């Protein structure tokens with residue numbers, strides 16, 4: 613909408629106060645004009661029609677329980693935009709500052725979040741498996757990263773290419789979580805998963821097997837559920853990424869860690885310069901080796917560690 617840029621205040625899903633960029637024109641809208649061609653947050657009103665209505669508020673204060681998922685979707689989309697711009701010199705998901713749109717309060721009891729080809733969508737959860745999913749910064753960044761992937765490598769959402777697609781979203785979700793630097797970890801979705809169980813998460817990158825996901829290519833899932841295991845076999849790549857950054861010895865193979873920043877540079881370059889819609893795990897290894905070679909040189913530690921990490925998870 614046309615209006616003037618304003619700054620509202622509200623509370624997110626976890627009860628924390630934050631400022632949010634809004635737009636005033638009769639109402640205050642969840643429309644942040646400070647980033648690209650805008651970040652826009654919508655109310656889906658417990659229905660499945662999308663996007664719903666652009667979020668309107670009478671007083672620019674967002675402290676109601678119903679407001680909390682909108683506050684976080686809007687704010688964390690801003691953090692994710694900032695990460696891509698400041699760290700990777702990428703302007704929104706398409707590289708040309710496309711408007712970023714999210715809808716909250718999608719459906720009833722909906723235990724998921726997704727990119728639908730055009731926008732982000734967040735359920736409220738059923739209060740048992742999830743609370744409103746925009747409360748997780750890693751979740752928000754996971755979803756926006758699907759849009760980045762779709763505009764760049766275009767990884768098809770099935771089998772190995774789809775597991776890479778998933779891992780890319782977990783990797784950058786985690787790197788955005790570290791960028792914001794509030795309780796960062798290598799776990800996925802811990803802030804909104806299972807409110808009655810402490811200390812768990814939907815996936816672990818540091819130890820995928822903690823939740824039954826494979827941590828070695830020889831343990832990959834080969835069936836048809838979950839688009840050929842895209843959220844399962846992602847553990848193999850997540851583990852490799854974790855090892856590149858943090859190091860470790862895994863199935864007897866030692867990896868010297870090179871840190872998060874270099875992990876992000878290597879995988880961002882792989883995603884945007886080398887991967888294709890049908891890339892498999894072996895081709896991802898080759899893309900990461902080439903990317904590290906471009907950035908750091910063929911004889912570098914960074915290249916050697918990429919090779920070590922993929923060896924550790926059984927990907928040649």
Ligand SMILES: CC(C)C[C@H](NP(=O)(O)CNC(=O)OCc1ccccc1)C(=O)N[C@@H](CN)C(=O)O
Pocket residue numbers: 724725726727728729745750751754755758769800801814838843
């Ligand atoms: C980080 C997480 C809390 C949320 C994450 N959602 P996502 O990967 O973005 C789910 N996208 C999808 O299906 O795209 C495919 C698609 C959907 C709609 C239109 C086009 C394409 C996830 O890990 N979900 C699991 C939750 N057991 C799942 O969906 O199995």
Ligand SMILES: [Ca+2]
Pocket residue numbers: 669670671672673674675
């Ligand atoms: Ca209000």
Ligand SMILES: [Ca+2]
Pocket residue numbers: 789794795796797802803
């Ligand atoms: Ca965390």
Ligand SMILES: [Ca+2]
Pocket residue numbers: 750786789796797798799800801802
């Ligand atoms: Ca996390």
Ligand SMILES: [Ca+2]
Pocket residue numbers: 802805806807808809810811812813
């Ligand atoms: Ca939990």
Ligand SMILES: [Zn+2]
Pocket residue numbers: 754758778781
């Ligand atoms: Zn995903």
